[PDB]
Write a protein that holds these residues in place. Structure first.
Motif, PDB file in Angstrom:
ATOM      1  N   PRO A  74       0.809  -1.209   0.000  1.00 37.45           N
ATOM      2  CA  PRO A  74       0.000   0.000   0.000  1.00 37.45           C
ATOM      3  C   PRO A  74       0.846   1.265   0.000  1.00 37.45           C
ATOM      4  CG  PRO A  74       0.146  -0.902   2.213  1.00 37.45           C
ATOM      5  CD  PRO A  74       0.888  -1.859   1.317  1.00 37.45           C
ATOM      6  N   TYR A  75       2.129   1.117   0.302  1.00 35.30           N
ATOM      7  CA  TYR A  75       3.018   2.248   0.376  1.00 35.30           C
ATOM      8  C   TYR A  75       3.907   2.380  -0.833  1.00 35.30           C
ATOM      9  CZ  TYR A  75       1.502   2.338   5.028  1.00 35.30           C
ATOM     10  OH  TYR A  75       0.738   2.436   6.106  1.00 35.30           O
ATOM     11  N   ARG A  76       3.589   1.663  -1.900  1.00 34.15           N
ATOM     12  CA  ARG A  76       4.415   1.786  -3.080  1.00 34.15           C
ATOM     13  C   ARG A  76       3.498   1.765  -4.297  1.00 34.15           C
ATOM     14  NH1 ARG A  76       9.618   1.893  -3.096  1.00 34.15           N
ATOM     15  NH2 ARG A  76      10.918   1.028  -4.756  1.00 34.15           N
ATOM     16  N   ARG A  77       3.673   2.738  -5.181  1.00 32.23           N
ATOM     17  CA  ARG A  77       2.766   2.866  -6.316  1.00 32.23           C
ATOM     18  C   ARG A  77       2.987   1.763  -7.317  1.00 32.23           C
ATOM     19  NH1 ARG A  77       0.868   5.065  -2.873  1.00 32.23           N
ATOM     20  NH2 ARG A  77       0.017   2.971  -3.131  1.00 32.23           N
ATOM     21  N   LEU A  78       1.935   1.379  -8.039  1.00 30.83           N
ATOM     22  CA  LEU A  78       2.030   0.176  -8.860  1.00 30.83           C
ATOM     23  C   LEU A  78       3.185   0.021  -9.837  1.00 30.83           C
ATOM     24  CD1 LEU A  78      -1.662  -0.536  -9.600  1.00 30.83           C
ATOM     25  CD2 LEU A  78      -0.127  -1.922  -8.276  1.00 30.83           C
ATOM     26  N   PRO A  79       3.610   1.003 -10.630  1.00 31.29           N
ATOM     27  CA  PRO A  79       4.706   0.804 -11.548  1.00 31.29           C
ATOM     28  C   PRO A  79       5.910   0.330 -10.762  1.00 31.29           C
ATOM     29  CG  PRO A  79       3.456   2.708 -12.109  1.00 31.29           C
ATOM     30  CD  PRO A  79       2.990   2.274 -10.710  1.00 31.29           C
ATOM     31  N   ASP A  80       6.389   1.128  -9.802  1.00 33.78           N
ATOM     32  CA  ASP A  80       7.508   0.601  -9.024  1.00 33.78           C
ATOM     33  C   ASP A  80       7.193  -0.636  -8.224  1.00 33.78           C
ATOM     34  OD1 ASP A  80       9.237   2.539  -9.673  1.00 33.78           O
ATOM     35  OD2 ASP A  80       9.105   3.575  -7.838  1.00 33.78           O
ATOM     36  N   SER A  81       6.023  -0.700  -7.643  1.00 35.37           N
ATOM     37  CA  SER A  81       5.752  -1.793  -6.744  1.00 35.37           C
ATOM     38  C   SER A  81       5.757  -3.101  -7.496  1.00 35.37           C
ATOM     39  CB  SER A  81       4.425  -1.544  -6.076  1.00 35.37           C
ATOM     40  OG  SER A  81       4.110  -2.519  -5.164  1.00 35.37           O
ATOM     41  N   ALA A  82       4.990  -3.163  -8.563  1.00 38.66           N
ATOM     42  CA  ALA A  82       4.927  -4.375  -9.325  1.00 38.66           C
ATOM     43  C   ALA A  82       6.268  -4.641 -10.003  1.00 38.66           C
ATOM     44  CB  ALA A  82       3.787  -4.290 -10.294  1.00 38.66           C
ATOM     45  N   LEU A  83       6.950  -3.591 -10.492  1.00 37.82           N
ATOM     46  CA  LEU A  83       8.245  -3.799 -11.127  1.00 37.82           C
ATOM     47  C   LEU A  83       9.265  -4.306 -10.151  1.00 37.82           C
ATOM     48  CD1 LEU A  83       8.362  -0.836 -13.498  1.00 37.82           C
ATOM     49  CD2 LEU A  83       8.435  -3.095 -14.156  1.00 37.82           C
ATOM     50  N   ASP A  84       9.205  -3.862  -8.903  1.00 42.23           N
ATOM     51  CA  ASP A  84      10.123  -4.368  -7.913  1.00 42.23           C
ATOM     52  C   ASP A  84       9.786  -5.806  -7.631  1.00 42.23           C
ATOM     53  OD1 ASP A  84      11.451  -2.059  -7.800  1.00 42.23           O
ATOM     54  OD2 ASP A  84      10.498  -1.329  -6.036  1.00 42.23           O
ATOM     55  N   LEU A  85       8.509  -6.149  -7.588  1.00 40.80           N
ATOM     56  CA  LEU A  85       8.206  -7.551  -7.376  1.00 40.80           C
ATOM     57  C   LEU A  85       8.793  -8.352  -8.539  1.00 40.80           C
ATOM     58  CD1 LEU A  85       4.523  -7.293  -6.091  1.00 40.80           C
ATOM     59  CD2 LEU A  85       6.492  -8.070  -4.758  1.00 40.80           C
ATOM     60  N   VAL A  86       8.705  -7.813  -9.765  1.00 42.17           N
ATOM     61  CA  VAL A  86       9.298  -8.478 -10.918  1.00 42.17           C
ATOM     62  C   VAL A  86      10.823  -8.518 -10.861  1.00 42.17           C
ATOM     63  CG1 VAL A  86       9.692  -8.398 -13.387  1.00 42.17           C
ATOM     64  CG2 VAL A  86       7.396  -8.032 -12.505  1.00 42.17           C
ATOM     65  N   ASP A  87      11.472  -7.401 -10.556  1.00 45.72           N
ATOM     66  CA  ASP A  87      12.928  -7.340 -10.552  1.00 45.72           C
ATOM     67  C   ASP A  87      13.526  -8.135  -9.427  1.00 45.72           C
ATOM     68  OD1 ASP A  87      15.433  -6.211 -11.642  1.00 45.72           O
ATOM     69  OD2 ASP A  87      15.589  -5.431  -9.665  1.00 45.72           O
ATOM     70  N   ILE A  88      12.928  -8.031  -8.254  1.00 42.94           N
ATOM     71  CA  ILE A  88      13.408  -8.737  -7.095  1.00 42.94           C
ATOM     72  C   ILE A  88      13.297 -10.214  -7.396  1.00 42.94           C
ATOM     73  CG2 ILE A  88      12.987  -9.257  -4.748  1.00 42.94           C
ATOM     74  CD1 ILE A  88      11.754  -6.429  -4.473  1.00 42.94           C
ATOM     75  N   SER A  89      12.145 -10.609  -7.954  1.00 40.66           N
ATOM     76  CA  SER A  89      11.944 -11.983  -8.343  1.00 40.66           C
ATOM     77  C   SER A  89      12.955 -12.392  -9.396  1.00 40.66           C
ATOM     78  CB  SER A  89      10.550 -12.168  -8.911  1.00 40.66           C
ATOM     79  OG  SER A  89       9.565 -11.992  -7.943  1.00 40.66           O
ATOM     80  N   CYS A  90      13.214 -11.532 -10.389  1.00 38.37           N
ATOM     81  CA  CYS A  90      14.157 -11.878 -11.437  1.00 38.37           C
ATOM     82  C   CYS A  90      15.524 -12.098 -10.866  1.00 38.37           C
ATOM     83  CB  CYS A  90      14.267 -10.803 -12.497  1.00 38.37           C
ATOM     84  SG  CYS A  90      12.850 -10.629 -13.522  1.00 38.37           S
ATOM     85  N   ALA A  91      15.921 -11.273  -9.903  1.00 43.73           N
ATOM     86  CA  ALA A  91      17.222 -11.451  -9.291  1.00 43.73           C
ATOM     87  C   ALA A  91      17.284 -12.807  -8.614  1.00 43.73           C
ATOM     88  CB  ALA A  91      17.494 -10.348  -8.293  1.00 43.73           C
ATOM     89  N   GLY A  92      16.206 -13.189  -7.924  1.00 40.90           N
ATOM     90  CA  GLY A  92      16.161 -14.489  -7.262  1.00 40.90           C
ATOM     91  C   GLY A  92      16.276 -15.617  -8.280  1.00 40.90           C
ATOM     92  N   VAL A  93      15.621 -15.441  -9.424  1.00 45.14           N
ATOM     93  CA  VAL A  93      15.641 -16.442 -10.468  1.00 45.14           C
ATOM     94  C   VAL A  93      17.027 -16.507 -11.065  1.00 45.14           C
ATOM     95  CG1 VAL A  93      14.837 -17.157 -12.649  1.00 45.14           C
ATOM     96  CG2 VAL A  93      13.313 -16.170 -11.131  1.00 45.14           C
ATOM     97  N   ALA A  94      17.653 -15.352 -11.276  1.00 45.58           N
ATOM     98  CA  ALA A  94      18.988 -15.297 -11.829  1.00 45.58           C
ATOM     99  C   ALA A  94      19.941 -16.056 -10.931  1.00 45.58           C
ATOM    100  CB  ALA A  94      19.441 -13.865 -11.981  1.00 45.58           C
ATOM    101  N   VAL A  95      19.748 -15.959  -9.617  1.00 48.11           N
ATOM    102  CA  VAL A  95      20.588 -16.726  -8.722  1.00 48.11           C
ATOM    103  C   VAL A  95      20.344 -18.199  -8.975  1.00 48.11           C
ATOM    104  CG1 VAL A  95      21.059 -17.363  -6.363  1.00 48.11           C
ATOM    105  CG2 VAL A  95      20.779 -14.982  -6.981  1.00 48.11           C
ATOM    106  N   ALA A  96      19.078 -18.604  -9.097  1.00 49.05           N
ATOM    107  CA  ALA A  96      18.782 -20.005  -9.388  1.00 49.05           C
ATOM    108  C   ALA A  96      19.389 -20.425 -10.729  1.00 49.05           C
ATOM    109  CB  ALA A  96      17.284 -20.241  -9.411  1.00 49.05           C
ATOM    110  N   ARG A  97      19.336 -19.540 -11.711  1.00 50.84           N
ATOM    111  CA  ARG A  97      19.878 -19.814 -13.023  1.00 50.84           C
ATOM    112  C   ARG A  97      21.373 -20.053 -12.915  1.00 50.84           C
ATOM    113  NH1 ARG A  97      22.465 -17.146 -16.802  1.00 50.84           N
ATOM    114  NH2 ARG A  97      22.060 -15.030 -16.064  1.00 50.84           N
ATOM    115  N   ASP A  98      22.052 -19.173 -12.186  1.00 50.75           N
ATOM    116  CA  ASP A  98      23.485 -19.250 -11.971  1.00 50.75           C
ATOM    117  C   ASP A  98      23.874 -20.478 -11.149  1.00 50.75           C
ATOM    118  OD1 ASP A  98      26.073 -17.764 -12.195  1.00 50.75           O
ATOM    119  OD2 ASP A  98      25.973 -17.846 -10.075  1.00 50.75           O
ATOM    120  N   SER A  99      23.026 -20.834 -10.177  1.00 51.91           N
ATOM    121  CA  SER A  99      23.262 -21.974  -9.300  1.00 51.91           C
ATOM    122  C   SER A  99      23.170 -23.296 -10.072  1.00 51.91           C
ATOM    123  CB  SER A  99      22.238 -21.970  -8.175  1.00 51.91           C
ATOM    124  OG  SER A  99      22.384 -20.830  -7.358  1.00 51.91           O
ATOM    125  N   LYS A 100      22.190 -23.370 -10.984  1.00 52.61           N
ATOM    126  CA  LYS A 100      21.895 -24.518 -11.842  1.00 52.61           C
ATOM    127  C   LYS A 100      21.260 -25.656 -11.052  1.00 52.61           C
ATOM    128  CE  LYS A 100      23.616 -22.644 -15.584  1.00 52.61           C
ATOM    129  NZ  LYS A 100      24.907 -23.108 -16.131  1.00 52.61           N
TER     130      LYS A 100
END
Ligand SMILES: Nc1ncnc2c1ncn2[C@@H]1O[C@H](COP(=O)(O)OP(=O)(O)OP(=O)(O)O)[C@@H](O)[C@H]1O
Ligand SMILES: Nc1ncnc2c1ncn2[C@@H]1O[C@H](COP(=O)(O)OP(=O)(O)OP(=O)(O)O)[C@@H](O)[C@H]1O
Ligand SMILES: Nc1ncnc2c1ncn2[C@@H]1O[C@H](COP(=O)(O)OP(=O)(O)OP(=O)(O)O)[C@@H](O)[C@H]1O
Ligand SMILES: Nc1ncnc2c1ncn2[C@@H]1O[C@H](COP(=O)(O)OP(=O)(O)OP(=O)(O)O)[C@@H](O)[C@H]1O
Lengths: 579, 445, 445, 112
Positions: A220-246
């Protein structure tokens, strides 16, 4: 060309691409352009809250400019992002930055096609006492072309124009706002390949949707473009770690675990172990809650509604726990928190005997503007900002002053809980419990230990005498805590001794616990009064059994299988050693 | 002080110019300025003069923009400016409307005739001021004309309240509404009568948004403190960003609907504040500023009438009973307040028939509220379920509010259980014991 | 060593010159200058002395401008300067009036020579300070003589208030009013009796604009804030925005009307300040400046007397009835306050006779205030519409307020709807049954 | 300074350096320098990298002072400096500890 020493040529970047696509902002852009196309006051502003596309609009118009998708006036115009060093390069010597600002406007004003500035943070210029204090250097020429698009949040905007008075007579506010959830998805989609490339992962289209919906129903404290994009980017970073980990952003698991990590809220995690989750909790609670399955089921039902999304997003589940004094309903609220969070101490609670019409609302939500103390949020939102989903508990809510009791309606429905300073909290996936002893008078009818039909209405009657119907009719369930009577208390005592054993420091001494009728009755006879309920079963267990045996432990008179028995009020347990 | 001795010798004739308060910060921090210059007050032109000014400037705008401006346009700008742009003096406000309207023509042409008139301006003004009246969207008169039926589709009965409001809206749209008198209502009756609900639906209707409303909860008031919650405090006292409830809302949304819940509980000093609002609209603000909320619609609610409306002397309240309601009002609020209410409206007690209709609408709202199109009913018992709800929720002193609770407890909790246990998928139906209950539509679908 | 070591030896005899503020900022920081310079007090001269000075300088002005100046003009200027230019020390102020007056003649001279008489000087003072009384607007005597007439056409009834105020105006205009006692009134009466309406109509009359009034909502004044709200804060506190509502207006509009809405509600601390303002006039600011309000007209209002007026004992308030009212004002306010009011006026009840005239006025004002001053009424039913409104609007104990509301309720609300439906252009008409209603224009518009 | 831009077209290649803080000043003061030079960020090494640097220089110090250095000492200098010399960047801080220490050994040794 002073401008080139301070500003970024957005047009050149657009010419070279290296920009994100701009999605859904066409109208903000059209408005921006329309104002720029004006004869005199061609000074639009992108105004709202941070993270709503204000600079996206500029990249957008820069691209429209490159492709001549703009009015005659702008066809060949260029745009520069300035601010920054323009006000600080002149760190020494009076009038130095002022000269730069002027030189820049001169450069812009004369000959070299139509140059438009972009001010990212107009409030930074402000006009600090006017008298040549930066922002004040502009107005003389705001009519003289020198077109400029500004940008500011509403708080910043209001601060500037209130203190200045001229800018609001020179600039054209354009409302910029967060997108709808679907529009958000389109945005996320537009930036999807950016994140996929930098992280080397895919994003499921459904992950974009989840991030958009989630953000709307999560941050509720973060507007949708950033909020949803952060959920996407933060998630992508987590996935990238999984990608790198294999890999990709998994709509369900990447985003849910990311969200669970970032905030919590059990509902957003929703465990897959359905065979037991939301099932076993009744058994776990039953051990804590002997006999009173009615309360367990009432709670469990709400918990089950929140999971998988049946519960209404704006209606925190909530209960009123009415009943026989000493019924154990407070511990229930904690044991529920136990299951919900795997944390019995997750909750936020308020002692309602401390509440008065003179202060209670502010004790709960904080004081307001101009008043002493800025412990914003008081007892409650002060804590909700850290744990939005914690269980809320109102101890003896029946003693709460009626005005604060009324404020608590916000917890029960239309979850826009606010703070004294005019701020919004917004609760949803948050179970709320209030407590009262009114049902004790009907439970004490002893017409079965379980409260019966009709008598439960007499309880509702007692409740209407103390709680407004406005409160009562908005509770997910009003739960009545029944008489435990002898059968439950025999079980409670056996159970309490067991549960204490499991938590009695370490399992070094172990218990036999053969209470026999003697100790079962002591605890059930000199303990469980209907009006003290289980409170004394635990107190006698601790005051007489755990204490006397503990003293023997301290003397090292106990090594193995402790027992319980009585002297035969003189019984007082009085236990032997077990060396 | 370079100019100082020079001016003292009559040399360097200097013409100055500045703002009333800027001047104050000069001369009262200097003295010599007052000695060196002869202030001349510059008047703000009258509306009539403003038009003459605009007319005089008209060809400059026509040439710049490549448009024609009609005289009615000039007049329109001056008229609208005085009434709808109170924070900007006429020479600018009127020009802003003309200039922007003309720009609108230029934009329109380039975005894909060029004659600026009264409607051109009125629409423009609406975009800049937010005043919906000036959209002049006459093809939408169907809604304005029939807003009574539209409101009646959300709330049941209470037609006098609907009509009272409808006229506030229609008067504003027609331009006949008194330019200085915000619409004002005092809604009286039982809790659960729909007083607040109506106000929400009015905000709904006018701006397609129930949250458009600015709510002030009078129960939080204290005559020793709370006036400042609405208008803030004055320079000096701790805190500023003043008037979170009124000042800081009204300067942004003049055309909004204000709602004052439970005004009878307001302490007298707040009720005193309301007098500005309900008269002229020139509500002052703590920092010495004014609001001028004449474009506002203001609804206040009270339960004083509960005392007599629950006499049950007809569902539709009759004379004598109604007058007793006014008795309670007159014995509580000062006449100074009451005389500023456009219409004091006493809500009717809901009839059993109304309850039936309410149940239908309320169930409709609940079904519509769901964000997941599995979560719905067919009910069966198409009358019987509703009659259960009425029989068990028709309260002569709680009105419809128990219908909401009854549904939540007897229907939605059963649904919650059914969702939890996966006993219901969709299209749920109702049955009755002796005690309404729901049927099972399990994982078959 | 700027000067210092030399001055200390009797070298460089130096004559200094500075203001008290400057002196203080130098001396209190330097120390040595306190002894290096030998302070000599120079007092501001008397009016008589000022005139003597003017006589001596008169030929410098006459020669420069090519005008002839009358000795009485010089006297006039010195007297006017003392009275109307309190912010500028007398020698300067008197000269400014003479010099500028001569300049007035000089401007005309180039376009047409003359002399500078007392009348010219007076005009000049008004040109620079407003203070309309010095315009010597004798051709406007008609208005002053008949302003009672004009006000009586705006406000029905309240003749005593109108006469009382008119006299304040006339005394000011005639130069009879006391330079240290701004005229002040306290209006007691029923709400809706026209207390603030009169005050606004007076500002209307005096300045051709109701908005000229320095309105102060004195009712919104709790003890701890109230004085600073009006005078501003003192040095060393948040918000050095000196003046709040009053200084910041009085210094620019010294000839204005002040209005205090419901002074009975103001905390007594406020009234305590007003005591000086109302009598003597030297209200000062929070920063230590003297404003001087004596050229203003002050109107204060309250409703204490409503409690007795409602007794219906006379339209014009009767003896005894008035004393009940005076009882209340004395019980509520300290006599220290009441004694300083130029006059306390108790408003009359707006009798049915009055409502007949009021209805006419309101109907006309309703048309006049329209933005779209096209959509006028024809009304029809002159006697029946007038009578309907006169009877139904006669809630005597609410003054004229109900009437305004009645017209709104019966006519404008319907009109607005008819407008949304395009049923009316202008010349709107009224019918009555038995209930007053509006007709339509078959020709939609 | 004008000779530089004026003649800069003829290759006349120049390599230079500046502190982050100074770069800001260069850019703001001249403008043309930003346009003429290619800014290059130079990184601070990690402790691991720092030690590798120290090892390369180890023999210079051993020779210069006539003392030996333990490899763990070089590690220590870099690691210790990272923790206790926050005001000095590692390329120098680590060396300061190595050079000062070596001197301390030689200094004591070669005292009276
Ligand atoms: N169409 C878009 N183009 C560019 N950015 C977008 C777009 N839509 C959303 N955004 C997001 O918004 C950010 C910039 O947009 P927005 O104006 O909302 O932020 P901002 O609040 O203007 O930035 P600032 O705090 O400087 O006002 C981008 O960095 C991006 O994350
Ligand atoms: N029906 C019940 N529900 C919950 N807990 C119970 C119940 N019966 C017995 N208990 C036991 O009683 C104890 C909890 O007592 P608690 O402090 O809640 O008293 P209380 O009745 O809540 O007091 P209050 O009248 O303020 O609510 C626990 O040890 C709990 O296991
Ligand atoms: N006439 C009606 N038509 C439809 N719904 C109604 C009606 N009257 C009441 N309700 C229901 O009552 C609820 C709100 O009612 P209402 O405005 O009476 O609350 P309230 O009593 O005004 O609260 P408050 O006593 O503070 O004003 C809504 O949820 C609405 O569905
Ligand atoms: N005698 C009158 N002649 C013309 N208009 C009147 C008269 N009396 C009242 N009004 C109308 O009443 C409105 C203001 O009335 P009034 O001064 O009575 O308010 P008020 O009751 O003084 O407010 P307050 O009770 O705080 O003084 C005006 O809009 C005016 O048109």
């Amino acid at each position: 060309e002073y401008l080139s020493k301070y500003a970024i040529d957005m047009t050149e970047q657009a010419r070279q691409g290296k920009l994100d696509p701009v999605i859904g902002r066409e109208e903000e852009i059209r408005s921006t352009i329309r104002v720029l196309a004006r004869r005199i006051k061609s000074n639009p502003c992108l105004i709202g809250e941070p993270g709503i596309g204000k600079t996206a609009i500029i990249e957008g118009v820069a691209q429209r400019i490159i492709d001549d998708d703009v009015p005659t006036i702008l066809q060949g115009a260029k745009l520069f992002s300035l601010d920054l060093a323009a006000l600080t390069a002149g760190a020494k010597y009076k009038g130095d930055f002022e000269e730069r600002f002027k030189g820049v406007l001169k450069e812009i004003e004369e000959s070299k096609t139509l140059i438009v500035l972009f001010i990212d943070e107009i409030h930074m210029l402000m006009g600090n006492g006017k008298d040549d204090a930066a922002n004040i250097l502009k107005p003389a020429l705001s009519r003289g072309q020198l077109k400029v698009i500004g940008a500011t949040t509403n708080n910043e905007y209001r601060s500037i124009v209130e203190k200045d008075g001229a800018f609001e007579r020179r600039f054209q506010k354009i409302e910029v706002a967060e997108p709808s959830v679907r529009q958000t998805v389109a945005i996320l989609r537009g930036l999807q390949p950016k994140y996929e490339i930098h992280h080397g992962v895919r994003i499921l289209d459904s992950a974009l949707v989840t991030a958009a919906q989630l953000a709307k129903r999560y941050l509720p404290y973060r507007r949708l473009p950033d909020s949803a994009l952060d959920l996407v980017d933060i998630s992508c970073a987590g996935v990238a770690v999984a990608r790198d980990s294999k890999q990709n952003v998994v709509d369900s698991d990447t985003i849910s675990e990311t969200a669970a990590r970032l905030t919590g809220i059990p509902v957003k995690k929703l465990s897959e172990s359905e065979n037991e989750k939301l099932i076993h909790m009744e058994r776990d609670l039953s051990s804590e809650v002997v006999g009173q399955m009615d309360a367990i089921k009432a709670v469990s039902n709400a918990v089950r509604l929140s999971r998988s999304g049946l519960a209404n997003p704006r209606q925190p589940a909530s209960f009123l726990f009415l009943g026989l004094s000493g019924s154990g309903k407070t511990e229930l609220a904690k044991k529920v928190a136990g299951f919900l969070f795997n944390d019995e101490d997750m909750m936020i609670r308020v002692d309602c005997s401390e509440l008065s019409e003179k202060y209670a609302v502010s004790k709960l939500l904080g004081t307001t503007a101009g008043y002493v103390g800025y412990d914003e949020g008081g007892f409650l939102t002060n804590q909700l900002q850290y744990k939005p989903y914690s269980v809320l508990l109102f101890d003896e809510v029946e003693k709460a002053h009626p005005d604060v009791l009324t404020v608590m309606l916000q917890m029960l429905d239309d979850g826009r809980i606010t703070s004294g300073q005019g701020k919004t909290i917004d609760c949803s996936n948050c179970i709320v419990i209030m407590t009262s002893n009114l049902g004790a008078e009907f439970i004490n009818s002893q017409q079965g230990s379980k409260i019966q039909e009709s008598t439960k209405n007499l309880v509702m009657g007692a409740v209407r005498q103390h709680f407004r119907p406005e409160f009562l009719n908005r509770i997910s369930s009003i739960v009545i805590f029944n008489k435990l009577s002898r059968k439950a208390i025999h079980k409670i005592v056996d159970i309490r001794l067991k549960e204490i054993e499991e938590r009695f420091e370490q399992n070094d001494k172990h218990y036999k616990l053969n209470l026999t009728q003697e100790a079962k009755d002591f605890l059930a006879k000199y303990g469980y009064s209907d009006d003290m309920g289980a409170r004394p079963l635990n107190r006698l267990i601790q005051n007489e059994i755990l204490n006397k045996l503990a003293l023997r432990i301290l003397k090292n008179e106990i090594k193995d299988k402790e027992t319980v028995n009585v002297v035969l009020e003189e019984c007082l347990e009085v236990l032997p050693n077990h060396e």
